[PDB]
Amino acid sequence: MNYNNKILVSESGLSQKHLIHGDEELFQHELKTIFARNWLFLTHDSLIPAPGDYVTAKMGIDEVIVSRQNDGSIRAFLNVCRHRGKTLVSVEAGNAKGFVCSYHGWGFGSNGELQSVPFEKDLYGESLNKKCLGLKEVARVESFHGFIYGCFDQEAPPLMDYLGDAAWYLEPMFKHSGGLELVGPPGKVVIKANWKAPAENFVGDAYHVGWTHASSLRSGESIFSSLAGNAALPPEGAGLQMTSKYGSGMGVLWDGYSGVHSADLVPELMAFGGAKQERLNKEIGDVRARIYRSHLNCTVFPNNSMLTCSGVFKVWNPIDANTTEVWTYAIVEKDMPEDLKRRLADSVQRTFGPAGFWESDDNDNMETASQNGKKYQSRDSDLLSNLGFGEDVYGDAVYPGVVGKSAIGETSYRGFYRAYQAHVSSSNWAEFEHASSTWHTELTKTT
Amino acid sequence: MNYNNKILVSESGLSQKHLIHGDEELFQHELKTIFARNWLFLTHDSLIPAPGDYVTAKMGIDEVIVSRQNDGSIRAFLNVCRHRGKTLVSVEAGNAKGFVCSYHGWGFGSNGELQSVPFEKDLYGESLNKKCLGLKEVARVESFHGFIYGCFDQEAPPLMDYLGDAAWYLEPMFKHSGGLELVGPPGKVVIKANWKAPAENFVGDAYHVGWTHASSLRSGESIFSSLAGNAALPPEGAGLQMTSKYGSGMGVLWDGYSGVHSADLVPELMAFGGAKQERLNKEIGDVRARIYRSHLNCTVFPNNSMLTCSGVFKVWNPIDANTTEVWTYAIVEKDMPEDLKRRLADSVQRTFGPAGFWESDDNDNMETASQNGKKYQSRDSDLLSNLGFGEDVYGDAVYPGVVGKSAIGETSYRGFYRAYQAHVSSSNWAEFEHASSTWHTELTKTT
Amino acid sequence: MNYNNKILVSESGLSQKHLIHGDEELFQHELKTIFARNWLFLTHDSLIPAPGDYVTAKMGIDEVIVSRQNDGSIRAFLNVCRHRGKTLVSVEAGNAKGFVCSYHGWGFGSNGELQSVPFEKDLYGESLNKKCLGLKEVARVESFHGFIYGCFDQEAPPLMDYLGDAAWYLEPMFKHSGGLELVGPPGKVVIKANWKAPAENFVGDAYHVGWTHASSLRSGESIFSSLAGNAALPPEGAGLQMTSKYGSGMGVLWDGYSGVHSADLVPELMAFGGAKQERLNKEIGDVRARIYRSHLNCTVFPNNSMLTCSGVFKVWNPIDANTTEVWTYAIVEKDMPEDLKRRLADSVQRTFGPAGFWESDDNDNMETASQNGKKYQSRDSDLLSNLGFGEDVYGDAVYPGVVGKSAIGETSYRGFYRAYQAHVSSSNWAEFEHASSTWHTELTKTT
Amino acid sequence: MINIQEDKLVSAHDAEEILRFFNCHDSALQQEATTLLTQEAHLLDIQAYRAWLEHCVGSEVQYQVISRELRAASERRYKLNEAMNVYNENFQQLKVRVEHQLDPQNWGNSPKLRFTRFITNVQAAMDVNDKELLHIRSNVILHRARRGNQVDVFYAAREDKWKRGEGGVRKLVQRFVDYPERILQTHNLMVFL
Amino acid sequence: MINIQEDKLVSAHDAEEILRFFNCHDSALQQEATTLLTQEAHLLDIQAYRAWLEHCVGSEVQYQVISRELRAASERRYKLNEAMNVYNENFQQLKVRVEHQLDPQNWGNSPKLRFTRFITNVQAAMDVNDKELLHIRSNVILHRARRGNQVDVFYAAREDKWKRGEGGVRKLVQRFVDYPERILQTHNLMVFL
Amino acid sequence: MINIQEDKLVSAHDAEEILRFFNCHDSALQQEATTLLTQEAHLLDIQAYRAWLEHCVGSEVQYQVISRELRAASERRYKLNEAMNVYNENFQQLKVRVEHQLDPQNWGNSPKLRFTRFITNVQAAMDVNDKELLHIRSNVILHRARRGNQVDVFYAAREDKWKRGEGGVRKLVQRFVDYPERILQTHNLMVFL
Numbered sequence A, B, C: 001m002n003y004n005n006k007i008l009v010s011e012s013g014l015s016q017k018h019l020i021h022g023d024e025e026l027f028q029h030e031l032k033t034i035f036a037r038n039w040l041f042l043t044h045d046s047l048i049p050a051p052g053d054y055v056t057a058k059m060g061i062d063e064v065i066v067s068r069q070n071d072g073s074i075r076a077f078l079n080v081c082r083h084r085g086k087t088l089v090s091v092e093a094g095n096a097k098g099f100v101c102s103y104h105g106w107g108f109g110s111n112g113e114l115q116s117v118p119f120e121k122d123l124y125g126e127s128l129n130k131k132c133l134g135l136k137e138v139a140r141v142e143s144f145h146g147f148i149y150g151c152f153d154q155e156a157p158p159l160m161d162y163l164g165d166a167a168w169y170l171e172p173m174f175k176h177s178g179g180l181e182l183v184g185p186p187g188k189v190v191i192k193a194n195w196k197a198p199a200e201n202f203v204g205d206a207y208h209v210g211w212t213h214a215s216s217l218r219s220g221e222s223i224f225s226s227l228a229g230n231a232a233l234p235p236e237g238a239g240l241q242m243t244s245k246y247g248s249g250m251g252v253l254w255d256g257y258s259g260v261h262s263a264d265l266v267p268e269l270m271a272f273g274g275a276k277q278e279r280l281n282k283e284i285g286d287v288r289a290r291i292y293r294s295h296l297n298c299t300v301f302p303n304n305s306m307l308t309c310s311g312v313f314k315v316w317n318p319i320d321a322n323t324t325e326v327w328t329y330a331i332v333e334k335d336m337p338e339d340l341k342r343r344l345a346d347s348v349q350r351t352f353g354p355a356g357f358w359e360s361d362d363n364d365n366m367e368t369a370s371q372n373g374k375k376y377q378s379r380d381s382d383l384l385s386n387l388g389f390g391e392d393v394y395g396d397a398v399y400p401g402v403v404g405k406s407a408i409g410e411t412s413y414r415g416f417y418r419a420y421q422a423h424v425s426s427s428n429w430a431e432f433e434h435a436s437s438t439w440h441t442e443l444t445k446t447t
Numbered sequence D, E, F: 001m002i003n004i005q006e007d008k009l010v011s012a013h014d015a016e017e018i019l020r021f022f023n024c025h026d027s028a029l030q031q032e033a034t035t036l037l038t039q040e041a042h043l044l045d046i047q048a049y050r051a052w053l054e055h056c057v058g059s060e061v062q063y064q065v066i067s068r069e070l071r072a073a074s075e076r077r078y079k080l081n082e083a084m085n086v087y088n089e090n091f092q093q094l095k096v097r098v099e100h101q102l103d104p105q106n107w108g109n110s111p112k113l114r115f116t117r118f119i120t121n122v123q124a125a126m127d128v129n130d131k132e133l134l135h136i137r138s139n140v141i142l143h144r145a146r147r148g149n150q151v152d153v154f155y156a157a158r159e160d161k162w163k164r165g166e167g168g169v170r171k172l173v174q175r176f177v178d179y180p181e182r183i184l185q186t187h188n189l190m191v192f193l
């Protein structure tokens, strides 16, 4: 396939070829144009707070070691020995001053440097240029309020710029709340779906909630429960949708601070969020203080998703076109009482973790939609994302980005796939920029 | 590989490159030129007799819903939602007026039409053109005496024409007997063989019976049992072989009405078939009345096979070059007493079903022959199908098609592979026709 | 990838692209340019000593029958029926005058000839040219002191010439000791590594022993045990490394006759080897008599490895880029007492067989190094094999081949990969020869 | 205990079998049933099929394994054949299958197959009406290995009736299995569950 | 017996559990525990989830399955959360999960799933302090099949505490499982181990 | 019962073992053997390898696992070595393997492996000649998980001899396993069956 010319995503992001969820050649091409190019979630300060702390993470199909340096910075390196290529670190987290390879014993520092080679003097003499043999380093590592992202491409925009208009919506909870912590370790499960299926669902699919999650809404005892079995549609301006230049987007469900949590947490959460909102009104204004305690379903392009307030944090780690390894953490506000933090983390896993009953409702939807992308008569068929098209706006006085002022729609799918087409048809960041010089006009056409 | 030029099957169908059973690129090419082009078995009237009855079936690697319409016709549709591509129906059979998608709740009628969209007015307003959003429909659906076939290609010949000369042989049992019913549900098993291996074996391999099935013949207590371990060769004109323009073919074993059934059914069957034959003599003549109660091993190109009289009915559903999902039903004559129908169906499964002891004898033959097609030194080797070449005739006064007047030979392999080459090297039905304008001359050369 | 031009291995074999352990297209290309071209281990005289004895073996991904002929020679044939391609022989060893196919009963002799066809006269008449239907024969089969190798390419050098300079080192143990026997049956295990990972480790990796095998050295009770955890480095000239034109190479560890065997065998072995060495001094000279009782870790290119003295004999049978089927036999000196032979064979399996505790230490190293070759950021990275470069010699007065006069280094990796590049970039043996006309100069550069 | 109007996922058949074991527990009977099944499994594992027929199988046996078509949980109109019989054998039919296994021209049996059976969750209860009959439920994991790298694992629950027989030789008069996998991924179901 | 300073790979928790069963063996108790677990597994296998809650689960239950992060065997500095809870349920939380299973709009339950559980290695010991409580250890292989060709097999050891209850109806008051696979390859862990 | 001239697929060895268990059944012995094997499996599962050696393994032990070459069922001429020993260990050799497992430089043991064993089909019979010896047969499913996504499952039948020992501490004097899979698909067989 010629990705310079092939229309995988139609103008304005209105539809996508179904093969995108199943084609292995495209998956390989995404490794280059999506995963090697864009910002990918690694870890949180809370998981590697002290010098020497490290974790392993995936970046696309590659594995990296993410390490807290002595000076307080974080550096990340491919988890691959520079000698004969053995995987250096076989654990998920720890604290160490360096990493020794189990094959020939080469020792690398937490800073990636080749620090020792067994019997170096006797064997290599002075011939080994250890300075040129440091671990392959992730070019860019940046933080968004403690959430650490990496990018293999030194030409990428800064992380804050890459978040674009989505950052404004995240800041009330990520910054003004006093900050969040990530509670590990994550759940880890493999699903037989393409990574884009859950990423698109979290970035902008409120339509599925009432029907897909009918059983979880009814038995679950949660605040959004009136939607079970499409018994009811959300109110007036019960929410909105947004998307951004670099593909990140989210839904906003006003005031839904207890999120997916069962009735056993609803009163406590609604009290806590409302109390903080009252303080935030004076600091960031009423609209942003309300956004803080509003449920955001968002995807940070390409493959990191979250539900704020519910506290669900996901990484959709790609394995092949129909295999994804799902990592699930909980996010909690740092100033919540410890006991509430613990209960909230368990509730996140209860609902969206490996035995998450809500997450279970989505399995078949994501796996069959993905696998159908391999079937001959469906490869060239069109997945539709036109709901709300011609009603989105750009440049609103209050809510930034391309915004659909309704709780349910497909605005965010269109922005995600727009950005996706622009990357898959581009060889570098400059070309992506050229292809995106009118990103918001393309998304608001007909309005 | 250039399939316009590559000789996969030699002139007259005398040999085939072994890679045809193992090459994945060719398998993908068959999805287009074999499975998307030709008539594929779906179901029987007996399985969906009433309005609203439906089943799911495979057509190649695609899955379809096959539904009895209110007007008594049958329509079939891809089992894929027109919104985001989720599999619509997760069961094998049922009765319903429509199908609702578990993702966002879109509801399609049994006629494929998009009939409802949750909250359509509030969400889409009048923007949704539901008339253009019906399920993707199988272009052609036709019946042969109750046996329902589908074809994705609107340019295909009518099913009766596609059966060509094979139809004459099937009609005594399929039509003149009063009709057949298919007894479901089928057995379903995956084998590690190419779909062509069992299809070629059923279309024209009587040679293997005595040797491959030695143990089943000896322990089985059946009418063809004198062949065990090649202890004996069939008589004079104990049978014949035939093939046709579009690839269908069969063997005929005169008078073998009890087929593979153990001695526990032999007397009852031989009595029943002989009694009906006596009535048929006056209606269709002695030769065709005898064909009715003669054992036919036939493949309806590409991947539907059967043993009449034994009552075995198979679909070799392709999964990849070395994986096939085998569906096994029983066929019974509608006017047989119910208790005989039940015993016959159990006997079909006993011998050729998931624990079929005869079918078990063929496993290793079909799986290793297929897997050997991937091995480097065998890819370009030649599978032989020359037995009987130069003794086949065209246009006989009594038995139509290209016919080998002997019970054991490879006439039907040659016709199957001829048709196969013509399709794989053609882009459409017109080209297949051009490539087949001398089909019978090619098959009878040297005679 | 264009293998005429792609630099997979840098000049002098100093580095290799990591993708060589993971690329499936290259694996397919190796089937042609490595496995179909070179000498591959089949069996030993000791396993098929009498007329009619046979075994099955792999040659690349193909399977062959290796049979002792009535005249005492050995012939090998593809294990594939010439009719419809079924696997002929389903066992690993036996004695027979021929092989009958379980599909249609064709019978082939131990000499490969098609000897019988069921009902030939009645079915084929005189039309079957059985003389042209013998099993596909392995073009070349030769013996090195009882060890039988096959080659599909009739243009290959004789086996002795192919061993090149490595033969000199093997002869003391393979010839002058009175000869070896192979003790079967082999252990058989699948590992998720590329075949080159264990082949490179056995051809010239002494560096890993102390670190990788730390636990086996310490608990094992063996002669090389002072190396555990890199507690100590071998002495002066404790050994050397060598490599050859056609890729075979080995390490030599002076006097290490008990090898990996635990202390329970050390005294008996050291006595036996020393006694034979004393006799050999007069026959082949002191240096070669010492080589006889010195531990050789060698790979006979491409995929046969051994540890002499330890008695480990391996075949790394390729399945795909990250799958190898490991066959492990024991080699013993024919004149050792029977009870010692038995204990030695058990010890070989104890240490390097399916539950070999030493072999277990290498698993993760070989599997992760291989699998990392598929990871996007590592495909184009460079595996290093520069240890000892610029200190190797050609044409030494005592030790032939390209030789590194030190126990630990990467001389043999460089010769193995040199030969590998030359084959992968060549279409035939003549081109390999042209590409190898300065093989030793390339390897000794900078010295 | 079970009320299938409340326990919505439970079939009437399954609820009837719960009732049979939850009442009247006889520890000695449970142990006897365990022994009996362990010995049967040993005979099958070593491929002593004639001995299994002679020592373990009653003349009146029905040996049945069904494959049930996948239907909607809410289905109430479609009433056609719900299942097919992978096995539905009387003694003579079992004997035919045993002769097929033992025939020296059963090419698929060379090299010799390897079977290993794991029997668990044994429950036993006497029939209320026929005092010659014992109801035994058990689950089985059956591992079949052949030809180097072929491995198939089967999983099932078995509902058996065994008769006392004579001389303490208990014999199977009914085995019923509703096979849990609709599409088999074991090449065939040519094994005695 | 166990000394974890010598048996370097053994955790303190695991050594404590060995000690509890190796001392004071009561064969009758072992058999009672086997019966109890077999009946529990039967109720779960037929998806009688309400009956399981009513007959087998105590009001004070803690039903916990953890996933432990992979750490170096020699790790001694990193002290953050070692595990997460796949399950950590009280009775009400179990009831929510049971209602979710029984809801007619639980689309993933149509067609009906098939479960088969294999319980082995049963050990039982009375609690030293609370004579209402029995410690039962057992291992379980759980096979889940659905939708034609989906098959997931789970493997685990269970550390349970069961209370005597009333009328001989023993009820689970704690189940603890440390799930052995860190990355699940069964689509989810939506099964009651 | 078994006649191997009639039961054509049965080996002489296998027929001899049937005979040993079908005669003289002692229910108490079966239960004792079950307890013993369950405790052994628990020690192995928690990787208490030193405790296993000390508490469960006799000084005179032969611990043997063979891999038999695939030969034609009709083969009668080829008489070379039929099998090889994956294990054939005396006590000292087992001790070497245990030290290898416990060594802190056994890099493959970090992160810590997880083992779960399922022992079934237990049969026991006293030796006819040596009254210190008990013959115990059992089958085992062994699940080994490591490093996130590596899972290997082993299946085997075990033919053991255990001696009474002293103080009621029974010890293994012989374990024999004929491994059913000829080509292993578990990376290695580095587990104690």
Ligand SMILES: c1ccc2[nH]ccc2c1
Binding pocket: A201, A202, A203, A204, A205, A206, A209, A251, A297, A307
């Ligand atoms: C609430 C709203 C939108 C959502 N997208 C995915 C889960 C989810 C929950």
Ligand SMILES: c1ccc2[nH]ccc2c1
Binding pocket: B201, B202, B203, B204, B205, B206, B209, B251, B297, B307
């Ligand atoms: C009888 C005759 C021909 C046949 N082809 C396949 C099965 C079969 C049975």
Ligand SMILES: c1ccc2[nH]ccc2c1
Binding pocket: C201, C202, C203, C204, C205, C206, C209, C251, C297, C307
């Ligand atoms: C000793 C020396 C070199 C070696 N290479 C592989 C095993 C081995 C043992």
Ligand code: FES
Binding pocket: A081, A082, A083, A084, A085, A086, A101, A102, A103, A104, A105, A106
């Ligand atoms: S591969 Fe890491 S030190 Fe050699």
Ligand code: FES
Binding pocket: B081, B082, B083, B084, B085, B086, B101, B102, B103, B104, B105, B106
């Ligand atoms: S995918 Fe079917 S309604 Fe959305």
Ligand code: FES
Binding pocket: C081, C082, C083, C084, C085, C086, C101, C102, C103, C104, C105, C106
């Ligand atoms: S395939 Fe061997 S005789 Fe036909």
Ligand SMILES: [Fe+3]
Binding pocket: A201, A208, A209, A212, A213, A358, A361, A362
């Ligand atoms: Fe959802």
Ligand SMILES: [Fe+3]
Binding pocket: B201, B208, B209, B212, B213, B358, B361, B362
């Ligand atoms: Fe057949």
Ligand SMILES: [Fe+3]
Binding pocket: C201, C208, C209, C212, C213, C358, C361, C362
């Ligand atoms: Fe090694």
